Coordinates of N, CA, C and O in Angstrom, one line a residue:
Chain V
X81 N 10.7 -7.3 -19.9 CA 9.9 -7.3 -18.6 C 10.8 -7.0 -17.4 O 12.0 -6.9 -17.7
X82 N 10.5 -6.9 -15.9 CA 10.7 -6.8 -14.9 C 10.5 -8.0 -13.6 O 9.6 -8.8 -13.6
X83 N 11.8 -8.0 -12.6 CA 11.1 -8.8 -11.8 C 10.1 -8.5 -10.8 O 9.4 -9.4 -10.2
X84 N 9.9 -6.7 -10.8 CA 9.2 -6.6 -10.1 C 8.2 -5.4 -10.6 O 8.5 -4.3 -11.0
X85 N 6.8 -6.1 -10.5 CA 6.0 -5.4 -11.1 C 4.9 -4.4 -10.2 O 4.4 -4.8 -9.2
X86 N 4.5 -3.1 -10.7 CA 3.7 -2.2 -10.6 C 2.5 -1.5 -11.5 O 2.6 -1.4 -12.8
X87 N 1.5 -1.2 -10.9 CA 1.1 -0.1 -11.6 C 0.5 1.2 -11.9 O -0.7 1.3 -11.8
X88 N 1.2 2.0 -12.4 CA 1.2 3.4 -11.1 C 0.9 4.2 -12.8 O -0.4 4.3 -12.9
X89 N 1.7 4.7 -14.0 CA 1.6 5.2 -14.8 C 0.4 5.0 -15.7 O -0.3 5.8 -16.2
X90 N 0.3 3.5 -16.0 CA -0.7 3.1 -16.7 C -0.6 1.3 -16.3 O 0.3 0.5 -16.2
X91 N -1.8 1.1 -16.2 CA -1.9 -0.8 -15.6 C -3.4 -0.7 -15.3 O -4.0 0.3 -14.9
X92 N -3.7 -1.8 -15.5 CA -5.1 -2.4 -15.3 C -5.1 -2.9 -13.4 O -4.9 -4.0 -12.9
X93 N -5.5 -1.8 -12.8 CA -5.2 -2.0 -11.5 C -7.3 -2.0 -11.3 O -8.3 -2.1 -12.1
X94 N -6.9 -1.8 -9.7 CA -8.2 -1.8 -9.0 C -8.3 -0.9 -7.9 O -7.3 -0.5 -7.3
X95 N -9.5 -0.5 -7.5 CA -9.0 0.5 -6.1 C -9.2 2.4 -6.8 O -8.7 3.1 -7.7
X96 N -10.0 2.5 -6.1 CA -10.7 4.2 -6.2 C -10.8 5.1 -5.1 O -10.4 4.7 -4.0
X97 N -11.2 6.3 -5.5 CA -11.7 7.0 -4.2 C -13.7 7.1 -4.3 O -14.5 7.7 -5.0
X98 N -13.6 6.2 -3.1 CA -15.0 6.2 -2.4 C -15.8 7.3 -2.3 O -15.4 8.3 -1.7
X99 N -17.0 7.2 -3.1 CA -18.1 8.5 -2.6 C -19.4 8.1 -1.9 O -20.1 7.2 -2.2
X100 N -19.7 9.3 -0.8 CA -20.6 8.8 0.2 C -21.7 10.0 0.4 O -21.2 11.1 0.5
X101 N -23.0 9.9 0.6 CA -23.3 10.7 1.3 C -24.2 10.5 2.4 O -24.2 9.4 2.9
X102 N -24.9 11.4 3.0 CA -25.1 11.1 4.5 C -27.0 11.8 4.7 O -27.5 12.9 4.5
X103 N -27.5 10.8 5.2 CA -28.8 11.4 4.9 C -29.2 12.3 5.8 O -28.8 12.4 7.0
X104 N -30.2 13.2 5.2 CA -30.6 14.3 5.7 C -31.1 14.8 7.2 O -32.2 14.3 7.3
X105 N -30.9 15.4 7.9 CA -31.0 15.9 8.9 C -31.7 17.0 9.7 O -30.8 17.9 9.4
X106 N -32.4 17.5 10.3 CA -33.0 18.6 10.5 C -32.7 19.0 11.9 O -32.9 18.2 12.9
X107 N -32.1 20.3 12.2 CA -31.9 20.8 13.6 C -33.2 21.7 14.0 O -33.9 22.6 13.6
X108 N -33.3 20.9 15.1 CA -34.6 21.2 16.1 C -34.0 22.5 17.0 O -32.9 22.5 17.5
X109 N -34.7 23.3 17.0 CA -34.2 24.2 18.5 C -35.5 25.1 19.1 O -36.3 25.9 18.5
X110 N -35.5 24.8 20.3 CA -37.1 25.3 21.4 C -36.7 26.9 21.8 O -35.6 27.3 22.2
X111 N -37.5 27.3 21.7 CA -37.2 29.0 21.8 C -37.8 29.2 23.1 O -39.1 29.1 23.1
X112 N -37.2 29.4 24.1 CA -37.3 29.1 25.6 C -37.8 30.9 26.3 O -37.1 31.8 26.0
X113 N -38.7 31.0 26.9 CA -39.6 31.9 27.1 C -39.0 32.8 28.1 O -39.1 34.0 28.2
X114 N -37.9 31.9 29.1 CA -36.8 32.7 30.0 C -35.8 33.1 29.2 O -35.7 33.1 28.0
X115 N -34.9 33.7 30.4 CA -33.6 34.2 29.9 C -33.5 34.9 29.4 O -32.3 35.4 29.4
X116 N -34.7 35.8 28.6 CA -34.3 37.1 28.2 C -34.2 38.3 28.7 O -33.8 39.3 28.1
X117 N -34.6 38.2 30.0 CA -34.1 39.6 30.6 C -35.1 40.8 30.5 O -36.0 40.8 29.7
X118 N -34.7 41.8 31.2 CA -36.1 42.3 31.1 C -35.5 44.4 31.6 O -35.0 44.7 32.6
X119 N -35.6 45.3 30.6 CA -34.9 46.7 31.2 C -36.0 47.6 30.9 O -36.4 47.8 29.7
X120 N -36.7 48.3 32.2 CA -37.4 49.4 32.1 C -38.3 48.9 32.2 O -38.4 47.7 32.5
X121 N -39.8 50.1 31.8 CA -41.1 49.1 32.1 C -42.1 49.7 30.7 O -41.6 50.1 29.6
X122 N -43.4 49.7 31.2 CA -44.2 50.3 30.1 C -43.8 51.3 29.3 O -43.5 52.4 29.9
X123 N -43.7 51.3 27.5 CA -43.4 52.9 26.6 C -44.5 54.0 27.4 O -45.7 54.0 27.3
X124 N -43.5 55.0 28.1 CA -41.9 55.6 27.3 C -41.5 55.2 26.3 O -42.1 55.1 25.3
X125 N -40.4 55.1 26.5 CA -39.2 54.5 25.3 C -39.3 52.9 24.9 O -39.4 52.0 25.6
X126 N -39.3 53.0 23.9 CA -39.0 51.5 23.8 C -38.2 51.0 22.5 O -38.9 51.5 21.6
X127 N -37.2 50.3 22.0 CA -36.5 50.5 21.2 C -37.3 49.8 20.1 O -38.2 49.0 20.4
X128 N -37.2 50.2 18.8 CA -38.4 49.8 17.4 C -37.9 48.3 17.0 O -36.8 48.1 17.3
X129 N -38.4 47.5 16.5 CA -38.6 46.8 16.0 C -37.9 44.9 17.2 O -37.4 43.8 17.0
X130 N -38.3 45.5 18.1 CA -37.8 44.8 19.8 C -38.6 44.1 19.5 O -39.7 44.5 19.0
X131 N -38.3 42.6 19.9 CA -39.2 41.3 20.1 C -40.2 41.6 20.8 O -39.7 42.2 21.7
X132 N -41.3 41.7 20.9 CA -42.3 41.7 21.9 C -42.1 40.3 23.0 O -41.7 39.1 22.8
X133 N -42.5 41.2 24.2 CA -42.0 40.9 25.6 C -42.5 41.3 26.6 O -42.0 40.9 27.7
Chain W
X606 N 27.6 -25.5 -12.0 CA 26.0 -26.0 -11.1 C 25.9 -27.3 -12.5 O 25.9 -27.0 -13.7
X607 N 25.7 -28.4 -12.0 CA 25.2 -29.3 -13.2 C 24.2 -29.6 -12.3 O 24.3 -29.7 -11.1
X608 N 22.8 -29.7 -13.5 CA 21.5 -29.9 -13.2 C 21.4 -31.2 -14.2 O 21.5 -31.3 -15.4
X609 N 21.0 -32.3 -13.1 CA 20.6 -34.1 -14.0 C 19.7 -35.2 -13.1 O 20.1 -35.7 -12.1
X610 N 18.4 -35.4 -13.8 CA 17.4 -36.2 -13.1 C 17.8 -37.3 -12.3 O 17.0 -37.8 -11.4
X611 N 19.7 -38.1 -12.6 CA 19.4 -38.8 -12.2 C 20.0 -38.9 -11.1 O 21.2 -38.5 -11.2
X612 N 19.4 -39.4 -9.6 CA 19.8 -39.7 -8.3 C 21.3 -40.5 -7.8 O 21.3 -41.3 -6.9
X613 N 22.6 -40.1 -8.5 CA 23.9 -40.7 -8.6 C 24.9 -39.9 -8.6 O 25.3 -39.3 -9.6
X614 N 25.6 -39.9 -7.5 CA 26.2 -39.1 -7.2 C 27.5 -39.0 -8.1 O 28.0 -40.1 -8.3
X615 N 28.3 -37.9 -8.9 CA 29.1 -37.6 -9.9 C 30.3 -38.6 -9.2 O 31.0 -39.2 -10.1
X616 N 30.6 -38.8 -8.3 CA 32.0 -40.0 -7.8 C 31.5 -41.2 -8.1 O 32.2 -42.2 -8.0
X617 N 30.3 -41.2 -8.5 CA 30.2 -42.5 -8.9 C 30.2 -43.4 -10.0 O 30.4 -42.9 -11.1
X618 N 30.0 -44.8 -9.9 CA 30.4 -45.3 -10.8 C 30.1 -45.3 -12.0 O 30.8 -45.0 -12.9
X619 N 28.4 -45.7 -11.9 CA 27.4 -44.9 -12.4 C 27.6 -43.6 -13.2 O 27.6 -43.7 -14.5
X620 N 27.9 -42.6 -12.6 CA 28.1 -41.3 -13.3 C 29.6 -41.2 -13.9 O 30.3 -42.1 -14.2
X621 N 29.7 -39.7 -14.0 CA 30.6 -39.8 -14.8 C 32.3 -40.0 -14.1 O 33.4 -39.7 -14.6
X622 N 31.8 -41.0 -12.5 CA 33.1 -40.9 -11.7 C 34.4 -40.3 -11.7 O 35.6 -40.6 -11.8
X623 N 33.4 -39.0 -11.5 CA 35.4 -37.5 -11.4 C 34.4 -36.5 -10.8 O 33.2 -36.5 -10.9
X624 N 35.4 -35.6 -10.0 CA 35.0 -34.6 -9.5 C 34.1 -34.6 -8.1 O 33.5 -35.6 -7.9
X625 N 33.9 -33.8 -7.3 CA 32.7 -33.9 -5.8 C 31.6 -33.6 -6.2 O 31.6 -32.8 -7.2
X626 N 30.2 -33.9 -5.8 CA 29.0 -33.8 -6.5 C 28.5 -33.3 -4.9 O 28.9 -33.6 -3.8
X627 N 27.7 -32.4 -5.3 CA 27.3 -31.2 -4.1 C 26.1 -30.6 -4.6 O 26.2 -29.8 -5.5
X628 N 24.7 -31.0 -3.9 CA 23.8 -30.5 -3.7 C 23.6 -29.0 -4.4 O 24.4 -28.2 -4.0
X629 N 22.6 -28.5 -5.3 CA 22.6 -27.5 -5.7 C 21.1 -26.5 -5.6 O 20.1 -26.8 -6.3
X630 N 21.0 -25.7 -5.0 CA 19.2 -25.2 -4.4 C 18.9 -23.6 -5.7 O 19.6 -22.6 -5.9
X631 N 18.0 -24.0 -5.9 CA 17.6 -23.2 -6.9 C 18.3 -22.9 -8.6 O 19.4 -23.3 -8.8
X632 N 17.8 -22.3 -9.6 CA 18.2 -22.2 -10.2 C 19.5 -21.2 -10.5 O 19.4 -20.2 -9.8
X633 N 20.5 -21.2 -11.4 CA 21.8 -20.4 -11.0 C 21.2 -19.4 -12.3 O 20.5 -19.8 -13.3
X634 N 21.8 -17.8 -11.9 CA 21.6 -17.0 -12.3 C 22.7 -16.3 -12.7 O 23.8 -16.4 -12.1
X635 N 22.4 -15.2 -14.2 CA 23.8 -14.8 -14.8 C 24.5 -13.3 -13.7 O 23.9 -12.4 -13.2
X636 N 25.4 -13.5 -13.8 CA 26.0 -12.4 -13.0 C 26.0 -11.0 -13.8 O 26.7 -10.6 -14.7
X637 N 25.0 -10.4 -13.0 CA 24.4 -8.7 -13.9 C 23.3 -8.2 -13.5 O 23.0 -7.0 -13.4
X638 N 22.4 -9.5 -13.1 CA 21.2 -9.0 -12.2 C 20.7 -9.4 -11.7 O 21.0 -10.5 -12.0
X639 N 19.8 -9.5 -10.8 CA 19.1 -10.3 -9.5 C 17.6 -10.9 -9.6 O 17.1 -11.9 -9.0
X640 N 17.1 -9.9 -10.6 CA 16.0 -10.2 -10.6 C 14.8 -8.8 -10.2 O 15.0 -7.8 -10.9
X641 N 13.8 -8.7 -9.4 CA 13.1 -8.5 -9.0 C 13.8 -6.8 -8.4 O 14.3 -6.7 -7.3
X642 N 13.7 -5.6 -9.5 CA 14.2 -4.3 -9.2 C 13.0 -3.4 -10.4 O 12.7 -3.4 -11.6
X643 N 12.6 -2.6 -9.1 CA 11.6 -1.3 -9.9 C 10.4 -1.9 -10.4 O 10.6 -2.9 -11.0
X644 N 9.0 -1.4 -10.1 CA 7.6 -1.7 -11.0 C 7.3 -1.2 -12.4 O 6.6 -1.8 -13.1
X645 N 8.0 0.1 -12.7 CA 8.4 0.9 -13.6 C 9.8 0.7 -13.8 O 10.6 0.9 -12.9
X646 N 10.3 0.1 -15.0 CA 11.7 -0.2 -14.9 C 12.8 1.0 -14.5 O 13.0 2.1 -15.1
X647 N 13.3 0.5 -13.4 CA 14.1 1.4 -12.9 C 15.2 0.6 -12.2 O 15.9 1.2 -11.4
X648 N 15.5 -0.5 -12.2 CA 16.0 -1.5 -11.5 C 16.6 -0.8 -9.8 O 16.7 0.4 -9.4
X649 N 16.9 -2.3 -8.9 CA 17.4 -2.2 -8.0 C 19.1 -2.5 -8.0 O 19.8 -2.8 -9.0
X650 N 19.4 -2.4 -6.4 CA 20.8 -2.9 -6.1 C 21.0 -4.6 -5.8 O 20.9 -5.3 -4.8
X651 N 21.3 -4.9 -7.4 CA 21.8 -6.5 -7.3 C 22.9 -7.0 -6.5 O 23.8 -6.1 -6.1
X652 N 23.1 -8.3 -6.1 CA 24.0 -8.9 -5.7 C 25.4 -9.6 -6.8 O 25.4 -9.8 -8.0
X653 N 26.1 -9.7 -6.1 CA 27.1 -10.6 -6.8 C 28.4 -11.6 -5.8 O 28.4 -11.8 -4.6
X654 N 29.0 -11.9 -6.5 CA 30.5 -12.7 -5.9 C 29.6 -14.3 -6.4 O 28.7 -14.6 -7.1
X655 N 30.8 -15.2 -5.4 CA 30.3 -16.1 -5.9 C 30.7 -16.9 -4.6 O 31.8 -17.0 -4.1
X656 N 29.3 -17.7 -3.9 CA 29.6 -18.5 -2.6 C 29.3 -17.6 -1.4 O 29.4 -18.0 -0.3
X657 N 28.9 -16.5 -1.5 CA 28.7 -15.3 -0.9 C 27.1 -15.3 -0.6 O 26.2 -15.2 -1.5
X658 N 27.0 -15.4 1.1 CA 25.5 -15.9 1.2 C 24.5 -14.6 1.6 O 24.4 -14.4 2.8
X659 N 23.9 -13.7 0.7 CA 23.5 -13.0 1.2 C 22.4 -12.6 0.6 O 21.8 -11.6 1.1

């Protein structure tokens, strides 16, 4: 035996790595009617597949 | 180191009256190792001498 004892290779220890998880969440986001800006006026031109605006 | 239950000091009459009788704290250990070196045997840096308080 030893005076001083461990146990690292093999021993009846205690103590793990923790598993967690985290409950589910949903991101909200408001699609705000300003801010987009505005170039030219009635087609003419108008580029294809453009948000309507 | 003499270790003996009974409360009489070695000068005395009682005892085996020869020699100074002096207080002795803990148990004496053989000179080679200290004890308490490595969890995985790998020992430590023991002590030695003798009267040497350290």
């Amino acid at each position: 035996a030893g005076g001083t004892g461990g146990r690292v290779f093999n021993t009846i220890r205690t103590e793990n790595v923790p598993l967690m998880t985290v409950n589910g969440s949903s991101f909200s986001l408001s699609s705000n009617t300003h801010s987009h800006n505005m170039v030219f006026g009635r087609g003419d031109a108008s580029g294809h597949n453009s948000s309507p605006n | 180191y003499r270790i003996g239950s009974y409360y009489i000091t070695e000068e005395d009459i009682n005892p085996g009256d020869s020699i100074s009788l002096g207080f002795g704290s803990w148990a004496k250990v053989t000179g080679v190792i200290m004890g308490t070196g490595v969890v995985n045997p790998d020992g430590s840096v023991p002590n030695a001498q003798r009267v040497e308080f350290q």
